[PDB]
Amino acid sequence: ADLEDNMETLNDNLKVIEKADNAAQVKDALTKMKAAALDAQKATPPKLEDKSPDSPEMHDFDHGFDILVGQIHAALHLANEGKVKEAQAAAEQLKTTCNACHQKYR
Amino acid sequence: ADLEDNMETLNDNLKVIEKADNAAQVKDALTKMKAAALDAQKATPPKLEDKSPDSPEMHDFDHGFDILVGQIHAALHLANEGKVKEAQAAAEQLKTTCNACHQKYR
Amino acid sequence: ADLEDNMETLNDNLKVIEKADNAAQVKDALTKMKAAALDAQKATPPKLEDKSPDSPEMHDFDHGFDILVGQIHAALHLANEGKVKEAQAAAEQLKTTCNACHQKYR
Amino acid sequence: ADLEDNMETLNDNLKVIEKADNAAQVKDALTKMKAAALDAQKATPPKLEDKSPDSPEMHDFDHGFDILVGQIHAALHLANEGKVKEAQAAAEQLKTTCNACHQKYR
Numbered sequence: 001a002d003l004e005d006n007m008e009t010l011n012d013n014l015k016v017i018e019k020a021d022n023a024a025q026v027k028d029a030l031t032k033m034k035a036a037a038l039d040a041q042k043a044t045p046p047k048l049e050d051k052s053p054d055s056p057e058m059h060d061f062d063h064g065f066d067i068l069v070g071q072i073h074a075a076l077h078l079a080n081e082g083k084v085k086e087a088q089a090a091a092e093q094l095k096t097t098c099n100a101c102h103q104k105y106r
Numbered sequence: 107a108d109l110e111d112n113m114e115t116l117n118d119n120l121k122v123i124e125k126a127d128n129a130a131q132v133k134d135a136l137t138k139m140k141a142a143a144l145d146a147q148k149a150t151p152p153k154l155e156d157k158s159p160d161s162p163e164m165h166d167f168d169h170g171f172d173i174l175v176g177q178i179h180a181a182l183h184l185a186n187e188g189k190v191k192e193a194q195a196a197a198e199q200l201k202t203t204c205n206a207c208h209q210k211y212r
Numbered sequence: 213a214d215l216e217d218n219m220e221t222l223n224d225n226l227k228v229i230e231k232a233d234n235a236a237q238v239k240d241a242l243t244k245m246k247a248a249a250l251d252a253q254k255a256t257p258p259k260l261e262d263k264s265p266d267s268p269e270m271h272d273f274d275h276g277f278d279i280l281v282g283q284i285h286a287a288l289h290l291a292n293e294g295k296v297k298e299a300q301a302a303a304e305q306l307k308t309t310c311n312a313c314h315q316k317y318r
Numbered sequence: 319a320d321l322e323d324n325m326e327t328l329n330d331n332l333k334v335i336e337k338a339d340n341a342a343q344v345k346d347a348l349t350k351m352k353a354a355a356l357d358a359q360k361a362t363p364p365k366l367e368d369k370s371p372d373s374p375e376m377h378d379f380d381h382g383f384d385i386l387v388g389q390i391h392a393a394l395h396l397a398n399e400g401k402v403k404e405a406q407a408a409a410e411q412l413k414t415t416c417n418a419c420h421q422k423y424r
């Protein structure tokens with residue numbers, strides 16, 4: 001999928017997590033977010049189209065996804081332990097990573 | 107230092123971060139928590155004293171600290187960007203990692 | 213792409229890197245291996261098809277890819293520095309990771 | 319300990335790994351290398367004391383240690399599997415990380 005498609009999947013699933021009632025629903029949404037994040041990672045965003053692949057900016061862009069994926073990983077552990085409210089809180093808190101990257105590269 | 111001492115350091119700095127007025131205070135506190143987590147990471151907790159250093163339990167224990175350290179790292183980005191409330195919120199959220207490891211190994 | 217196809221992509225590029233004489237070739241090859249490794253993570257291998265998504269086996273399987281991805285990342289740093297032979301050795305190095313997962317989950 | 323002494327621990331143990339005759343000796347030295355690398359992470363090199371802990375340089379310096387620690391973790395897995403020759407080759411290979419950082423910040 002292209003970058004924007006994966007971003008939509010990321011955004012859609014955050015909403016699903018916010019309104020979910022049980023752990024299974026949260027786990028499923030988080031799993032989809034992980035796949036979308038990883039798929040997004042191979043993209044070169046418009047704002048960095050003219051930068052070299054080895055540029056500090058592309059390295060930072062990639063690092064942003066690593067941070068996100070890590071937060072998704074931790075959230076999954078919480079969901080897997082049936083801690084719905086905590087997993088939901090983790091999904092909400094990681095919005096700060098979405099924001100940080102957007103400020104720099106969206 | 108002893109596992110328990112690093113744990114005391116982690117607990118106290120969560121309080122320092124909560125009471126912080128500014129970004130500098132939160133950064134310093136996160137930095138201290140990082141040191142404590144990495145030092146605590148080489149210890150053998152009492153409940154796993156009978157386990158081989160190479161065991162699923164000790165690998166998971168080690169992984170738990172990696173999760174915590176990754177959260178401190180993300181929180182540090184927020185504080186370094188002057189986002190005091192966000193960094194404070196990130197510190198609050200990572201309490202779930204503290205709790206998750208305790209439930210299994212404390 | 214599916215698990216098997218991403219694997220063939222990993223194998224083909226490892227061979228490309230081995231025959232490479234310039235950094236551009238190595239960079240391109242690792243780039244493709246990174247995309248393939250990440251794409252493969254969304255897959256559930258046949259051997260773990262009937263194990264819970266949160267099983268220790270699935271967490272270990274995921275860990276294997278993280279180790280692989282990290283090795284690719286380290287190799288890319290060397291490739292981007294024009295250190296061809298160093299990058300090639302890093303690529304050869306990680307075959308041990310390929311083998312480890314295969315013995316356990318293939 | 320300080321940055322300098324932890325670096326000594328890293329250097330000495332690499333020699334121990336090269337001279338090692340069994341898996342346990344290698345695992346033991348790698349374990350000491352991990353502790354030293356992590357403990358080392360809490361330091362600001364002389365050449366970066368002028369840079370903010372928030373600069374791209376300080377972040378890159380920090381990242382370097384994470385790369386090294388990841389390579390140590392992967393080497394541990396090999397040593398734990400009794401693959402002495404392989405673990406020795408991993409140790410030899412991670413020397414590129416040692417050099418890559420030194421070139422920039424030593």
Ligand code: HEM
Nearest residue numbers: 004007010011045046061064065068097098101102105106
């Ligand atoms: C879960 C967190 C995230 C959410 C919910 C999210 C959501 C979105 C949405 C709704 C869009 C606009 C979609 C469109 O233009 O069609 C977008 C765009 C974008 N996102 Fe994110 N995003 C997240 C994390 C990230 C991260 C971590 C990075 C960087 C490492 C990033 C980089 C981008 C870029 C570069 C664009 C612009 C794409 C374009 O206009 O071509 N995003 N994101």
Ligand code: HEM
Nearest residue numbers: 110113116117151152167170171174203204207208211212
């Ligand atoms: C910021 C998060 C954390 C906080 C605030 C925290 C706080 C504490 C505190 C106050 C204690 C009691 C110490 C004592 O009574 O002497 C403790 C014990 C312990 N913590 Fe944590 N901890 C955190 C994260 C972790 C993590 C991530 C792990 C595991 C990966 C962990 C493992 C333990 C263990 C095993 C003990 C018991 C030590 C013993 O009884 O000897 N902690 N922690």
Ligand code: HEM
Nearest residue numbers: 215216219220222223257273276277280309310313317318
């Ligand atoms: C660069 C390292 C790797 C290379 C070169 C590689 C290569 C391959 C190749 C060529 C195949 C298909 C062989 C056949 O047709 O029978 C394969 C299958 C497989 N690999 Fe890997 N692999 C690597 C790493 C990994 C890792 C790290 C894991 C696990 C974490 C893994 C899990 C699997 C599994 C589960 C299969 C079987 C898929 C199926 O039959 O449906 N591989 N790999």
Ligand code: HEM
Nearest residue numbers: 322325328329363364379382383386415416419420423424
């Ligand atoms: C296992 C790999 C490594 C080995 C064997 C190693 C070894 C050493 C040695 C022997 C020294 C000289 C100590 C002295 O002055 O007495 C040194 C210095 C230093 N190392 Fe490493 N090192 C390694 C990895 C790293 C990495 C990954 C970084 C960067 C992230 C790094 C950064 C430094 C710096 C900045 C110094 C200068 C210290 C000073 O000026 O006091 N080293 N290293």
Ligand SMILES: [Ca+2]
Nearest residue numbers: 003004005007
């Ligand atoms: Ca759009």
Ligand SMILES: [Ca+2]
Nearest residue numbers: 108109110111
């Ligand atoms: Ca104690």
Ligand SMILES: [Ca+2]
Nearest residue numbers: 114115117118
């Ligand atoms: Ca106190």
Ligand SMILES: [Ca+2]
Nearest residue numbers: 130131134135
């Ligand atoms: Ca201070």
Ligand SMILES: [Ca+2]
Nearest residue numbers: 216217218220
């Ligand atoms: Ca095929």
Ligand SMILES: [Zn+2]
Nearest residue numbers: 073077169271
């Ligand atoms: Zn995990």
Ligand SMILES: [Zn+2]
Nearest residue numbers: 063179183377
């Ligand atoms: Zn960072």
Ligand SMILES: [Zn+2]
Nearest residue numbers: 059285289381
């Ligand atoms: Zn890097």
Ligand SMILES: [Zn+2]
Nearest residue numbers: 165275391395
């Ligand atoms: Zn491991």
